[PDB]
Design an enzyme around this catalytic site. Sequence first.
Site, PDB file in Angstrom:
ATOM      1  N   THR A 162      -2.582  11.683   2.235  1.00  0.00           N
ATOM      2  CA  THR A 162      -2.474  10.498   1.392  1.00  0.00           C
ATOM      3  C   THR A 162      -1.987  10.859  -0.005  1.00  0.00           C
ATOM      4  OG1 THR A 162      -4.246   9.413   2.638  1.00  0.00           O
ATOM      5  CG2 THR A 162      -3.726   8.533   0.451  1.00  0.00           C
TER       6      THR A 162
ATOM      7  N   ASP B  13     -10.463  17.161   9.805  1.00  0.00           N
ATOM      8  CA  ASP B  13      -9.873  17.497   8.514  1.00  0.00           C
ATOM      9  C   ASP B  13     -10.757  18.462   7.735  1.00  0.00           C
ATOM     10  OD1 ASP B  13      -7.832  15.702   9.165  1.00  0.00           O
ATOM     11  OD2 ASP B  13      -8.851  14.032   8.170  1.00  0.00           O
TER      12      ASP B  13
HETATM   13  N1  LIG Z   1     -17.011  13.580  -5.010  1.00  0.00           N
HETATM   14  C1  LIG Z   1     -15.846  13.433  -5.685  1.00  0.00           C
HETATM   15  N2  LIG Z   1     -15.838  13.194  -7.016  1.00  0.00           N
HETATM   16  C2  LIG Z   1     -14.693  13.044  -7.710  1.00  0.00           C
HETATM   17  N3  LIG Z   1     -13.477  13.121  -7.139  1.00  0.00           N
HETATM   18  C3  LIG Z   1     -13.333  13.357  -5.813  1.00  0.00           C
HETATM   19  C4  LIG Z   1     -14.540  13.529  -4.995  1.00  0.00           C
HETATM   20  N4  LIG Z   1     -14.118  13.746  -3.736  1.00  0.00           N
HETATM   21  C5  LIG Z   1     -12.761  13.715  -3.740  1.00  0.00           C
HETATM   22  N5  LIG Z   1     -12.295  13.483  -4.983  1.00  0.00           N
HETATM   23  C6  LIG Z   1     -10.863  13.380  -5.370  1.00  0.00           C
HETATM   24  O1  LIG Z   1     -10.116  12.660  -4.387  1.00  0.00           O
HETATM   25  C7  LIG Z   1      -8.793  13.198  -4.309  1.00  0.00           C
HETATM   26  C8  LIG Z   1      -8.227  13.105  -2.898  1.00  0.00           C
HETATM   27  O2  LIG Z   1      -9.212  13.479  -1.935  1.00  0.00           O
HETATM   28  P1  LIG Z   1      -8.791  13.806  -0.414  1.00  0.00           P
HETATM   29  O3  LIG Z   1      -9.984  14.398   0.297  1.00  0.00           O
HETATM   30  O4  LIG Z   1      -7.465  14.530  -0.419  1.00  0.00           O
HETATM   31  O5  LIG Z   1      -8.530  12.328   0.167  1.00  0.00           O
HETATM   32  P2  LIG Z   1      -7.451  12.085   1.338  1.00  0.00           P
HETATM   33  O6  LIG Z   1      -7.877  13.039   2.428  1.00  0.00           O
HETATM   34  O7  LIG Z   1      -7.618  10.625   1.687  1.00  0.00           O
HETATM   35  O8  LIG Z   1      -6.126  12.420   0.694  1.00  0.00           O
HETATM   36  C9  LIG Z   1      -8.881  14.640  -4.781  1.00  0.00           C
HETATM   37  O9  LIG Z   1      -7.788  14.942  -5.653  1.00  0.00           O
HETATM   38  C10 LIG Z   1     -10.219  14.756  -5.489  1.00  0.00           C
HETATM   39  O10 LIG Z   1     -10.043  15.128  -6.859  1.00  0.00           O
END
Ligand SMILES: Nc1ncnc2c1ncn2[C@@H]1O[C@H](COP(=O)(O)OP(=O)(O)O)[C@@H](O)[C@H]1O
Lengths: 536, 518, 518, 44
Positions: free
Chosen positions: C91, C384
């Site tokens: 994403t 994932d």
């Molecule tokens: N607990 C959290 N607190 C703050 N930011 C978070 C947390 N978990 C994820 N993020 C932010 O979300 C963003 C994308 O997360 P990701 O796991 O890659 O989502 P996706 O898999 O949908 O792309 C990351 O850049 C991260 O900084």
Amino acid sequence: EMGRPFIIVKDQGNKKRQHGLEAKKSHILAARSVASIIKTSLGPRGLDKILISPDGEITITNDGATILSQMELDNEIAKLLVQLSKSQDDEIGDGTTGVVVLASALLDQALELIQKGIHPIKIANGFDEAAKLAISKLEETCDDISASNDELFRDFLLRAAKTSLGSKIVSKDHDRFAEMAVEAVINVMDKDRKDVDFDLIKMQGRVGGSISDSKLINGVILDKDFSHPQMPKCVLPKEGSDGVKLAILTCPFEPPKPKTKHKLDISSVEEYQKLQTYEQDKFKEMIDDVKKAGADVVICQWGFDDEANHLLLQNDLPAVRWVGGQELEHIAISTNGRIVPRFQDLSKDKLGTCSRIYEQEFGTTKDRMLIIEQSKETKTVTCFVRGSNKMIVDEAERALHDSLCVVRNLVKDSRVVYGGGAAEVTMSLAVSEEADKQRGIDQYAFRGFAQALDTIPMTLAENSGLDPIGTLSTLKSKQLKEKISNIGVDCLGYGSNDMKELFVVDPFIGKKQQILLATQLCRMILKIDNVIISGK
Amino acid sequence: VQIFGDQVTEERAENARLSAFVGAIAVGDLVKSTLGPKGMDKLLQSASSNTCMVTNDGATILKSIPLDNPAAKVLVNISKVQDDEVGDGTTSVTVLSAELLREAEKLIDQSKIHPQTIIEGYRLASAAALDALTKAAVDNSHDKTMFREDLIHIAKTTLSSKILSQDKDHFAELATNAILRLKGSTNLEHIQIIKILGGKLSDSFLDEGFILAKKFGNNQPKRIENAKILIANTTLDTDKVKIFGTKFKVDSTAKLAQLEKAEREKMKNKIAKISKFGINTFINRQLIYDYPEQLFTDLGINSIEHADFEGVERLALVTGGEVVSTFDEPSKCKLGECDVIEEIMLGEQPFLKFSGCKAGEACTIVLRGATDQTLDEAERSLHDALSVLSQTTKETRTVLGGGCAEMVMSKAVDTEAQNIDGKKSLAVEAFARALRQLPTILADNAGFDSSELVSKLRSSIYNGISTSGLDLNNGTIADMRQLGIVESYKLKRAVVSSASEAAEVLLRVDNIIRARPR
Amino acid sequence: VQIFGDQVTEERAENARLSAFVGAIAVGDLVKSTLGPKGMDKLLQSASSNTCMVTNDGATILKSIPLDNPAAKVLVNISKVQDDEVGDGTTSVTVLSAELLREAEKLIDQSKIHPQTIIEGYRLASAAALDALTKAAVDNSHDKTMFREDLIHIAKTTLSSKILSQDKDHFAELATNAILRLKGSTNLEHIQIIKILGGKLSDSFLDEGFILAKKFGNNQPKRIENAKILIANTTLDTDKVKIFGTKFKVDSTAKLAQLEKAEREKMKNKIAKISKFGINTFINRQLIYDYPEQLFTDLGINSIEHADFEGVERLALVTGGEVVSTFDEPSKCKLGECDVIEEIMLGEQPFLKFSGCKAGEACTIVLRGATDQTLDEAERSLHDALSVLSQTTKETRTVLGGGCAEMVMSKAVDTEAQNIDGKKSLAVEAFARALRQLPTILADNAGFDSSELVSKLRSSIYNGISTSGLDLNNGTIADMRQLGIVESYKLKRAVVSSASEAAEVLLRVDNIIRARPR
Amino acid sequence: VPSNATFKNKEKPQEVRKANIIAARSVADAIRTSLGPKGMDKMI
Ligand SMILES: Nc1ncnc2c1ncn2[C@@H]1O[C@H](COP(=O)(O)OP(=O)(O)O)[C@@H](O)[C@H]1O
Ligand SMILES: Nc1ncnc2c1ncn2[C@@H]1O[C@H](COP(=O)(O)OP(=O)(O)O)[C@@H](O)[C@H]1O
Ligand SMILES: Nc1ncnc2c1ncn2[C@@H]1O[C@H](COP(=O)(O)OP(=O)(O)O)[C@@H](O)[C@H]1O
Ligand SMILES: [Mg+2]
Ligand SMILES: [Mg+2]
Ligand SMILES: [Mg+2]
């Protein structure tokens, strides 16, 4: 069936039916579909909506009646809501959106009570007793303003004028539209401050200019030029005179002919020359009659003749043509003149009086529109509204019409209440208090109406972007702590949930009409069991 | 529960704002090329009869093109009002009102500003904008020679945008003389623009008189001198009396021979009353038949037939006389005068030339061009030029253009944004940044830089020089008083108010309702 | 003239461009809501067979939705290969690729910069970003306790956006314990996902040993203590003999009865070869016929049939032994041992549970839930997580999450923006605003103000500190090391590298050629 | 107080969640009749 065609009503296969619980869910969800349209429109932070007629013309409106009026619908439940908004628009002219959201709030809370198995008549009787109980309480708590003098009574109209203009178009010049709206009623009013005639003030818009160019003029608006424009455009009065001596005539400048079909036979050349003499002497006698009467400007209904126009230019007599009969009704009341039928009955007592007559361009080539102004107070005010767009000036008409209607409600004595969500919450907590001892079977019926009244403050919370639960919790706790009931939602963020500091006022007759039309329609929709609809 | 009928398109989500915002961007980008002196003309292909139309004004373009978007109608209607009100600056309203919605788009999406906050900043920003024009204006009413020079520079500014950018030096003298001819009459209908195809574009002229589109009937001469003009709107031809119930009870045809003779006697008597004035020319709006035409030959009076009623108003004011009817009283009636009258020929159609008239309260302009399309463009031009200069007489105050008008507004608008601390400051800055784009597209049409050239104009005004602006022929900053370009106060007041109020329209929408077409 | 043919859409330089950017906007707005911990899941309805799919992964959303736009197909493919490489962060590629093109749309329109000049700014900006990303990383794996803790934080950061966000404290132990049991072997085929209906989300328990969905024979016992496990890729079915082309010529049916006796004696001797080892269970890949099944009864041997190809390696690695087919030499091929061979029931299906094995190089994640749509989300969520944690074993470097990686990369980009002359420096700043837009979107999905937290985070990191980040639970800036938010270095390196190549492909376009479909 | 810190765009998720709730409750109304001893049987 038994094999034979079992048919009862004509067009059996086309029309359908609906009963049971599914008929009710079609009704309540149909109201929620209309309520979602109105919920995001209500309040000062609302948003207009744009409508498209079949003929391509559009209207940018945010008044529930004009939205629902130009909306092509199929469901009959929304068509009754179309007429409910039109009912509020015709008589009071304030709260169309409310009547709609409020009726849906009673319908939404009635959905939960139908699930419990309460009969609809007990539901309808509960709102009828609760509506009259809330009206009986709100009639006691509101204060009278008739004890104050005329200087403060003008300020109360400014409180309601700024309330009605806001939430609508021309928010930019709303301070001047409030003064202009109040100044229109100062001229047109009864000495006893009662039963003012609304038909004396008509609406008139003009496509052009800007909102700042609008001003007040006491006179008539004609969309036409003078006859044969060689004279000066702006005619002035004499040095010593009572006025311009306006003259109006419902007879065209021609020889007198019978109304019935006639056959004037000329059997000789001598009689033919007398017809030429009769033709010229009538025009000569006609211009001498208006000359001796002292008239300067002449208004003709059925128009005139090329030969008298010249006779009108040499004597310094402007004139017009094709003036409709509805405008002559407006000219006689404004200038305080009497319309003479013919020239034989012409007398100086029947002629009107006004300050001056003049015309301007408004631009390049649009049209020459006539303007009239008075030198004192008269029984006629014509709002001269300008606009940069046709939809702007069209919305400014119905917006200013609602403003004059809100002031018209305040002409009635002892009808004032402070709105802003205060009227809804102050009528809500008392209904829940009555239910604690008037429990019966209708205990939940009062609770439904108590929760339905509070939805309008929650609607204002959504449009303003504030927390609804924190807002209603603070208003409910403040109403229980202190019995002062003029505190409401601070929509414009000037602090002060109190409503006297913020100069907002609603008509008392308009506010009680909200729950009446809402409860009276909810009593009708809940009676419906079978829903028979035919195909188009 | 679908409350609406069949084929009812409704948008109650973010797509409604996107569909309304993208419609203004499409209308906005359509007119970005038409702005400025280096702008390109556009071409319209009509759907009926293949009647083409070349026009640079956005009002004629947007009214001609079909657009089903409700947002497009607002841009069409605001341009129609600006075309009717002032006659110039329509594309500026269209591109500025679209850019205000373009700049307001990112506030809704990126910064997530309430729509009521964006309009609330535009109210205070527009108030400070008009206040800048209050102090930035200059009144040149005390001297007529300077006001005569102001009408030149306004004609230089308005005519430069159309195809007449080269010939504006010659038509600037032609435009200002027509305004000084009218001496304050702001009615544009008193100027007859005679369309003639062929010849060089610079062959236009402004004769001191009124040029007819028609000629003499049968035998009246071409060249005469010391002619008295008399105008009538009189049937003056086979007089059908005011009551149509008239009849003749004829007992014998010999008596009816006297009745038709009596119709000729009264007509002979009417023409005999015309000769009592002692005139040499007679003009009537109705077409003259054969019998009254013949009686003018023996009297030595000229006759002109089938004049239009709008031309009688122009004809009366150039001649300075008065339209006379009911000719029994020649004493009270008035008639005009002229020195010489002569029939000329410009192309195939002959015309009547008047020169040496006493009154000069009106005129006629004869245009010359290669194609009917160029002639049309030309016409539309002088109409927009004369419309602005006509309103300049009643509104004497003027404002310097060339990017200086938009920037001095932004200087005052940016100053007021700090005293309104909160979230409203981003809305007022969006109104400021919307005004920076008008000199940007004016630089993009000429093929110059959008950032560095605007940045030099930014720094020049804050240093304390309120006369700097863009110069497109060289691509650098220059003084506006030396170049000599200036607009009227009513124009800049109109486009700022029209573009401001136009932005208020499509920012309060939250639903688009489309019923069935009929 | 016409050069392509009928029913062929062609576009040229104003319809070609702005059709890919609006397609990049169309594909980006869909996956905007799915980014972050407070993101909403998108439901996909199939056009055929009424098949629904609840999924949060941007790759799976783009797999199912048909998209005829060619520019959107680039975003479809880059999310596919990103799911193939890392498994997480698809994403972020689609959002960052769309916002890079959204910024470049303004640089082409507003600033009027060539597309090739924008790419040259992105090459230097991407190089500065990756250099800052390399220096911002930190070493690991020197202490197993710290390596254990960082995998727990990576599992919490990965599952914060999925359906396991509430129970990530429990699933982090389940995710990290399985990876350490692999003993360095990076492969996802050694982990089984058994679908069980019933229970709640937090009922997923860690299994000791290996569990699978198989069954014993007809006559086999329930429990055997200290069972020796064997795996046969053999054919205990009707073996035939493999020289296909054998037939049986028969002169009389006396020897044919003895021939069938030899066939039963042939397989009897083969099962007798199994009993020389003295095993307690027998696992076969394919179906076992009844006659071999009856022979395992008296010998005290369990039987499991119809094992999948993946199940052979998944069970053999836990057993520790090797797959044997010849059964000739009992010296080599030392088998493992299992203590508890008793099966259990979870729902309506019995599963063979093992416990007390030699090695646990393969695992099995038992899941419990209400709807299969939630179990499918549970499968994609932990797939994932396990994919990211498995690649963290081979690639040791990590980087702080919580939006700090995006801003700390843009710090070096903004530092290198000043010393670059020309118009490409604006494109270098456009790359910085693209990195800033990711944490702007994290605040939008959480419902908090984005401009304040981005402004506070941006001003805080330039002061000198580089450990601050966004805390969406409280809605303020906090220390990421305290909360324990960290992600892998190869993840963000792949995202920035893939997003840079994504904008590069679509920015080098000038025409679109859409041939006729079949 | 007002016009600060947010503005709720994209209200279509709110409209979609309402459509899913009334769609699930409408199916539940048909199953609600079969509850308890005084429920009824369904033929499909
Ligand atoms: N607990 C959290 N607190 C703050 N930011 C978070 C947390 N978990 C994820 N993020 C932010 O979300 C963003 C994308 O997360 P990701 O796991 O890659 O989502 P996706 O898999 O949908 O792309 C990351 O850049 C991260 O900084
Ligand atoms: N300036 C204001 N300040 C506070 N409340 C206001 C203001 N203007 C309108 N309101 C409130 O908004 C509510 C809805 O009014 P509105 O829907 O605009 O009128 P109508 O229903 O006649 O169109 C009213 O109850 C009124 O009290
Ligand atoms: N020779 C020039 N030097 C500098 N500026 C010019 C020149 N010619 C035109 N302009 C600028 O270009 C603009 C043209 O506006 P115009 O096309 O008349 O708007 P509209 O067509 O909407 O009335 C003017 O504001 C003027 O300042
Ligand atoms: Mg109202
Ligand atoms: Mg112009
Ligand atoms: Mg993830």
